Design a binder for this molecule. Structure first.
Ligand SMILES: [Mg+2]
Ligand SMILES: [Mg+2]
Ligand SMILES: [Mg+2]
Ligand SMILES: [Mg+2]
Ligand SMILES: [Mg+2]
Ligand SMILES: [Mg+2]
Ligand SMILES: [Mg+2]
Ligand SMILES: [Mg+2]
Ligand SMILES: [Mg+2]
Ligand SMILES: [Mg+2]
Ligand SMILES: [Mg+2]
Ligand SMILES: [Mg+2]
Ligand SMILES: [Mg+2]
Ligand SMILES: [Mg+2]
Ligand SMILES: [Mg+2]
Ligand SMILES: [Mg+2]
Ligand SMILES: [Mg+2]
Ligand SMILES: [Mg+2]
Ligand SMILES: [Mg+2]
Ligand SMILES: [Mg+2]
Ligand SMILES: [Mg+2]
Ligand SMILES: [Mg+2]
Ligand SMILES: [Mg+2]
Ligand SMILES: [Mg+2]
Ligand SMILES: [Mg+2]
Ligand SMILES: [Mg+2]
Ligand SMILES: [Mg+2]
Ligand SMILES: [Mg+2]
Ligand SMILES: [Mg+2]
Ligand SMILES: [Mg+2]
Ligand SMILES: [Mg+2]
Ligand SMILES: [Mg+2]
Ligand SMILES: [Mg+2]
Ligand SMILES: [Mg+2]
Ligand SMILES: [Mg+2]
Ligand SMILES: [Mg+2]
Ligand SMILES: [Mg+2]
Ligand SMILES: [Mg+2]
Ligand SMILES: [Mg+2]
Ligand SMILES: [Mg+2]
Ligand SMILES: [Mg+2]
Ligand SMILES: [Mg+2]
Ligand SMILES: [Mg+2]
Ligand SMILES: [Mg+2]
Ligand SMILES: [Mg+2]
Ligand SMILES: [Mg+2]
Ligand SMILES: [Mg+2]
Ligand SMILES: [Mg+2]
Ligand SMILES: [Mg+2]
Ligand SMILES: [Mg+2]
Ligand SMILES: [Mg+2]
Ligand SMILES: [Mg+2]
Ligand SMILES: [Mg+2]
Ligand SMILES: [Mg+2]
Ligand SMILES: [Mg+2]
Ligand SMILES: [Mg+2]
Ligand SMILES: [Mg+2]
Ligand SMILES: [Mg+2]
Ligand SMILES: [Mg+2]
Ligand SMILES: [Mg+2]
Ligand SMILES: [Mg+2]
Ligand SMILES: [Mg+2]
Ligand SMILES: [Mg+2]
Ligand SMILES: [Mg+2]
Ligand SMILES: [Mg+2]
Ligand SMILES: [Mg+2]
Ligand SMILES: [Mg+2]
Ligand SMILES: [Mg+2]
Ligand SMILES: [Mg+2]
Ligand SMILES: [Mg+2]
Ligand SMILES: [Mg+2]
Ligand SMILES: [Mg+2]
Ligand SMILES: [Mg+2]
Ligand SMILES: [Mg+2]
Ligand SMILES: [Mg+2]
Ligand SMILES: [Mg+2]
Ligand SMILES: [Mg+2]
Ligand SMILES: [Mg+2]
Ligand SMILES: [Mg+2]
Ligand SMILES: [Mg+2]
Ligand SMILES: [Mg+2]
Ligand SMILES: [Mg+2]
Ligand SMILES: [Mg+2]
Ligand SMILES: [Mg+2]
Ligand SMILES: [Mg+2]
Ligand SMILES: [Mg+2]
Ligand SMILES: [Mg+2]
Ligand SMILES: [Mg+2]
Ligand SMILES: [Mg+2]
Ligand SMILES: [Mg+2]
Ligand SMILES: [Mg+2]
Ligand SMILES: [Mg+2]
Ligand SMILES: [Mg+2]
Ligand SMILES: [Mg+2]
Lengths: 132, 387
RNA sequence: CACAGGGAUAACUGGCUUGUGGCGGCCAAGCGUUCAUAGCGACGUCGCUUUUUGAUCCUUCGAUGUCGGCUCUUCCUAUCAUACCGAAGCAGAAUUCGGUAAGCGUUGGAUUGUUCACCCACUAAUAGGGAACGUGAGCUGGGUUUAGACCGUCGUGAGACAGGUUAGUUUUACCCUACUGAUGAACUCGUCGCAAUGGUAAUUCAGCUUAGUACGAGAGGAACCGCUGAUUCAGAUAAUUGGUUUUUGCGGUUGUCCGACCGGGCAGUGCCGCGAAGCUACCAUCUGCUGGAUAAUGGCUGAACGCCUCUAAGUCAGAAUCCAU
RNA sequence: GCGGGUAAACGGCGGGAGUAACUAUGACUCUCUUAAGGUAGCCAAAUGCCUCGUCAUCUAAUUAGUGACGCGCAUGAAUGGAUUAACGAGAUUCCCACUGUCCCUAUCUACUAUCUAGCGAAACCACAGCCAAGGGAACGGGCUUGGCAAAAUCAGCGGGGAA
RNA sequence: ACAACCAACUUAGAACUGGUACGGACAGGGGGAAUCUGACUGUCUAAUUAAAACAUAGCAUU
RNA sequence: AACGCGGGGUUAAGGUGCCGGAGUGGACGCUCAUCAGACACCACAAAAGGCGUUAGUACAUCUUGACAGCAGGACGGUGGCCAUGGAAGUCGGAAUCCGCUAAGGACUGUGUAACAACUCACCUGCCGAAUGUACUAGCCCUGAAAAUGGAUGGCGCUCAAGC
RNA sequence: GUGAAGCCAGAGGAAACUCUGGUGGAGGCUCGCAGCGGUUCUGACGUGCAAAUCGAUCGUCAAAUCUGAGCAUGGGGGCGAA
């Protein structure tokens, strides 16, 4: 789970389907859990841009489907603000498949990537294009 | 049988008598511990909540993510015209607690503070302190000197009776607020001399507090009326198909105790509670006579703290004001009680020196996009009304 | 299906009992390379508990609403995690056992009415229970389930089944008390205070540094202090962002009516865009203290008992504990 | 009574033991009994208890669903079997769309509730109404022992009155 | 074969134009892959059951 | 202990610190519990264990002097017999006799390519009246964990107001 | 809305019967208003407006459709798409 991450508005609860921003062969990612989630009755675990989640591939390559993968949310449509006071949001929700260590399965990232993911995951920062 | 899934209780029992506050003015229930080695000083002050605004500053916090970068922070503004010290109260120790042995008043009291002693000031004879005023003339103030000497001899706690100059605020109220402010430091004789020298004299809030100081704000919170459990205690809403109401608590107690217990959430009064919020940093103490009290070293535009069009539902801050990081209990126009901190501060967040860079002065009445009227005129150009 | 009754008599709570269920102790053959007692542990034996099920029939049959789930509060400890300690077949790391300990937490889902269970996943941990098998004038009605209906087996039949399936009305509070809030007579009316008593609050994790250092042949690999964040909880607040729109504020627009235009009515807010103010969201922001006394343990001095010994007199330190602030 | 017919009359439709160049099973056989011993089909089906049967598929996870399998407690041929386009306010599973069902609640409108003028019931009621423990008909409002305990009241409320 | 006179509506094509909007209110089907079951339309427990129950045509028997 | 309505006296069971009428009555002991105990029926407790009090058995010292707290000695055949480059008491095993000393074994362990120095049993010597072992049973303690807050009846009680 | 027989015309072919525009206006067909009914909210109400109503949502809607008056069947009897 990323360390040093500041509090931000979480846009994607468990059950959300987001786009796959890398070229691993998956079309989307279906979030089943979040790594940092605590315990609270009835509260769905939720994640924001730049934290690790557990996801399954609903549409994509057959040898990527039917499994559980670690993923990192690279952009979200729910507006949130950083310490600079600017509220920002992306067009869609998207994430990338990674190892438990944080290394991407794919080799390229399509579209922009939120700054939090790039700061917290060096592999995503190296593979990313436009950041924020 | 046991509760199936564990969950913490809703709300706190530490604020349990969720009743209306007994008094509108906030109550200082504890003053900072006295230290005779320190110089004599007042420990509290009063002001009026004007509103909130936004500031930008460079954060000085090594190791933090936002270190040496701009941060946007919400701040609160308290209009603080100088208070007037009008009295002294001496307190002695007793096996039953502290008790006031005596109090001494100034020779002249203003109508602002005299209004506090009346319910029907308009139709009264306004005789509040007329007989007391004669004591300064009879026997060359022998009784006044006697009471001051009694306070010096016996009392261990000295407080000044001070009132607000509410007429300098845009408030429609004319009745001033009066309270006791403890004098800390020095001996009891020093405290008495300080309080007596301050008689019918104004004290400004920059002589009491200073920038980057952590203070406490005491006030009565915003009042809501009779409120159900869902908002009053934050309980879970019952399903949509619930008969006879879903905005409730389903079980309000088991069988065997055979009483509704004090720990069960129930509908009732919400808000208008006395609160002592602590650890608020003073970002700026601006002066009323300063025509650019909202200006900055990096923002040289001559502007005052008041937003464009005035503070919504307050007016203009024409007096000295304090800027407090974050929010404080109470609505606008409320009488705020500022108290010195009871804690010892060692964290770098508490000890940081704050240097502002920009203070928002755009309109509070909408999506204000300009900081000054001159900026508005420059951007828009000439209008039809300018002829 | 009916009636007269029965708590003389069953099904559900409670009561006695505790075989059974659960949880401990004593002994210690044996296991544990070596060694009964680090940790297990046979034969035997002493118990505790009433979250199992039996046994009984004391209360209720002129009726105490019968499962489960949801919601919510509190209590218990036989402690899953968190605090501080002691022991190891404890080099480090990770574990295991035990002590003081119930302050604080103990989750999101697939299948199933479930209880129970088992999987997926997160987590510090996903501990076990009570409160009329807590909680139906709180809900719901999925289960049990009257009357309709189908099947299988049984019956000559009407019909039966602790078998499967489908459909099947969930009433009343305005009384008393309890609780949540709100007034208030009497002691002149006010202002400023005190504080008996009652309540009480915080919680856990992560990253950086320590440090690839202590310890290790090596694989590997702590910690104290300090710094920065985050989870759960609590109390506020609305500068900003988002939601809400009868501001029916401005604009657009359908039908119809006022002869057309202008300006309007009606369609219970005609509809649409924007929309200040107010309310409000971990959907937003701010804030959450330290003193004393201790428990287990670690000690000092020091007898009993010429020696020893933290204890007997005395005394130091010390836990998420207790009492205060 | 006797003797024939009749199942689109009511209805019924069986056990045991060996057996194929390793083996498993048993085509085949040996044997006991019936009126006849379940044929064509179909199935953990609204019919199977064991059972959340076994395999495959659907999911991250499926006591659900579907497709297969069948010594089927207890399927089966007008007590109708199997299939079936179209139809169904019938029961069930999944997918897309959709959304406050939910995360997690917030806000707005009307009418109530609310306060007032007027009018104005009913249910129910041994007496009544604060608890803790004890004993007691083994769950007290009254009894015993303690805690305690201050007029008169309003809006809510659903713990108790085994209402 | 053209001109004149008379008469409603229905359809089609083009240009321009604005808020990229136009069945602008009102009015007004969600759809698909399957399983069980009854063929279908129809009928019944008025006041808890609308169903797979009843009926039906067809088939068969007496 | 059985009952008509009354007065006086005396008792029973039970009580006399206060509630509560009557004793902070008298005598001799026991018990300190960071879960004291105090309830005939009766309203909770056991096997097992612990240096407080008493008791039964046996033992040591009896001045020739106990346990605890101390210095010193283990002579001399003795390379004994088997074993060996080499282990003379201290690799391997069966066995340790004494002429001069209150006491010293072919030796209790240490050391060691063989040794030696060192150590123990024991005692002449410092001292100085009570000592060790195993048991028995009184009180107390551990064993002794449940759910609203709580009950030797309550308060409280410790040279008892407990036994 | 769909568009059954019957009918007109034109295309093929060899025949016979194929095809294509139209016409037509059948069906216990279909969407849907009134009527009739009463599925779900297990909504309102539940000392009600009401001893069965109210709202939304639903089934059917050209025929086993809905309905008036007159008449018949009368209690172990009637009547019953049960
Ligand atoms: Mg909330
Ligand atoms: Mg309901
Ligand atoms: Mg504003
Ligand atoms: Mg009985
Ligand atoms: Mg038992
Ligand atoms: Mg053991
Ligand atoms: Mg039992
Ligand atoms: Mg019974
Ligand atoms: Mg009964
Ligand atoms: Mg009864
Ligand atoms: Mg009841
Ligand atoms: Mg559930
Ligand atoms: Mg314990
Ligand atoms: Mg532990
Ligand atoms: Mg607690
Ligand atoms: Mg979790
Ligand atoms: Mg029970
Ligand atoms: Mg129950
Ligand atoms: Mg109830
Ligand atoms: Mg009910
Ligand atoms: Mg229930
Ligand atoms: Mg049901
Ligand atoms: Mg039935
Ligand atoms: Mg059945
Ligand atoms: Mg059913
Ligand atoms: Mg139904
Ligand atoms: Mg207190
Ligand atoms: Mg080393
Ligand atoms: Mg709030
Ligand atoms: Mg807005
Ligand atoms: Mg707004
Ligand atoms: Mg609107
Ligand atoms: Mg307009
Ligand atoms: Mg118009
Ligand atoms: Mg009109
Ligand atoms: Mg409308
Ligand atoms: Mg808007
Ligand atoms: Mg010592
Ligand atoms: Mg001591
Ligand atoms: Mg067969
Ligand atoms: Mg079939
Ligand atoms: Mg079968
Ligand atoms: Mg099955
Ligand atoms: Mg089938
Ligand atoms: Mg099935
Ligand atoms: Mg499902
Ligand atoms: Mg299945
Ligand atoms: Mg199947
Ligand atoms: Mg059969
Ligand atoms: Mg059959
Ligand atoms: Mg046949
Ligand atoms: Mg059959
Ligand atoms: Mg057939
Ligand atoms: Mg079909
Ligand atoms: Mg009312
Ligand atoms: Mg009235
Ligand atoms: Mg009466
Ligand atoms: Mg009681
Ligand atoms: Mg009892
Ligand atoms: Mg009782
Ligand atoms: Mg009663
Ligand atoms: Mg009493
Ligand atoms: Mg009273
Ligand atoms: Mg009510
Ligand atoms: Mg009640
Ligand atoms: Mg009653
Ligand atoms: Mg369209
Ligand atoms: Mg429709
Ligand atoms: Mg049908
Ligand atoms: Mg009929
Ligand atoms: Mg009915
Ligand atoms: Mg009936
Ligand atoms: Mg019905
Ligand atoms: Mg007499
Ligand atoms: Mg007498
Ligand atoms: Mg006595
Ligand atoms: Mg007396
Ligand atoms: Mg005495
Ligand atoms: Mg005595
Ligand atoms: Mg003691
Ligand atoms: Mg004890
Ligand atoms: Mg008794
Ligand atoms: Mg014993
Ligand atoms: Mg003893
Ligand atoms: Mg006691
Ligand atoms: Mg007594
Ligand atoms: Mg007594
Ligand atoms: Mg005695
Ligand atoms: Mg039809
Ligand atoms: Mg109708
Ligand atoms: Mg209803
Ligand atoms: Mg009602
Ligand atoms: Mg209706
Ligand atoms: Mg609606």
């Amino acid at each position: 789970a990323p360390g040093g991450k500041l509090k931000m508005t979480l846009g994607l609860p468990v059950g959300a389907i987001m786009n796959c921003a890398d070229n691993s062969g998956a079309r989307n990612l279906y979030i089943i859990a979040v790594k940092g989630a605590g315990a609270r009755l009835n509260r769905l675990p939720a994640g924001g841009v730049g934290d690790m989640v557990m996801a399954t591939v609903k549409k994509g390559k057959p040898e990527l489907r039917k499994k559980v993968h670690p993923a990192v949310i690279v952009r979200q449509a729910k507006p949130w603000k950083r310490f600079d006071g600017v509220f920002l949001y992306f067009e869609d929700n998207a994430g990338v498949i990674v190892n438990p260590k944080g290394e991407m399965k794919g080799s390229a990232i399509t579209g922009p990537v939120g700054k939090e993911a790039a700061e917290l995951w060096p592999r995503i920062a190296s593979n990313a294009g436009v950041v924020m | 049988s046991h509760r199936k899934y564990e969950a913490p209780r809703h709300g706190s029992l530490a604020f349990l008598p969720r009743k209306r506050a007994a008094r509108h003015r906030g109550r200082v229930k504890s003053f900072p511990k006295d230290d005779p080695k320190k110089p004599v000083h007042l420990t509290a002050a009063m002001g009026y909540k004007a509103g909130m605004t936004t500031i930008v500053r460079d954060l000085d916090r090594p190791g933090a993510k936002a270190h040496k970068k701009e941060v946007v922070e919400a701040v609160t503004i308290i209009d603080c015209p100088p208070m007037v010290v009008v009295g002294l109260v001496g307190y002695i120790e007793t096996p039953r607690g502290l008790r006031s042995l005596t109090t001494v008043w100034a020779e002249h009291l203003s109508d602002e503070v005299k209004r506090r002693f009346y319910k029907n000031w308009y139709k009264s004879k306004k005789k509040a302190f007329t007989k007391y005023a004669k004591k300064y003339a009879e026997n060359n103030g022998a009784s006044i000197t006697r009471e001051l000497e009694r306070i010096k001899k016996y009392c261990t706690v000295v407080r000044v009776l001070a009132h607000t100059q509410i007429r300098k605020t845009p408030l429609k109220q004319k009745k001033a607020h009066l309270m006791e402010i403890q004098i800390n430091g020095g001996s009891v004789a020093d405290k008495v001399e300080f309080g007596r020298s301050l008689f019918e004299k104004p004290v400004t809030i920059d002589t009491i507090f200073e920038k980057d100081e952590m203070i406490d704000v005491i006030a009565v919170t915003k009042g809501h009326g009779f409120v159900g459990v869902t908002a009053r205690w934050g309980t879970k809403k019952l399903p949509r198909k619930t008969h006879k109401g879903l905005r409730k608590v389903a079980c309000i107690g088991a069988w065997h105790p055979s009483h509704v217990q004090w720990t069960v959430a129930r509908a009732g009064q919400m808000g208008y509670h006395h609160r002592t919020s602590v650890n608020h940093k003073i970002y700026r103490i601006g002066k009323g006579d300063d025509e650019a009290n909202a200006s900055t070293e990096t923002d040289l535009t001559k502007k005052k703290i008041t937003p464009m069009g005035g503070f919504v539902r307050y007016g203009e801050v024409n007096n000295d004001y304090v800027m407090i990081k974050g929010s404080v209990p109470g609505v606008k126009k409320r009488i705020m009680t500022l108290r010195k901190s009871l804690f010892t501060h060692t964290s770098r967040k508490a000890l940081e020196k704050v240097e502002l860079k920009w203070i928002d002065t755009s309109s509070e009445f909408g999506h204000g996009a300009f900081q000054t009227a001159a900026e508005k005129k420059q951007f828009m150009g000439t209008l039809k009304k300018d002829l």
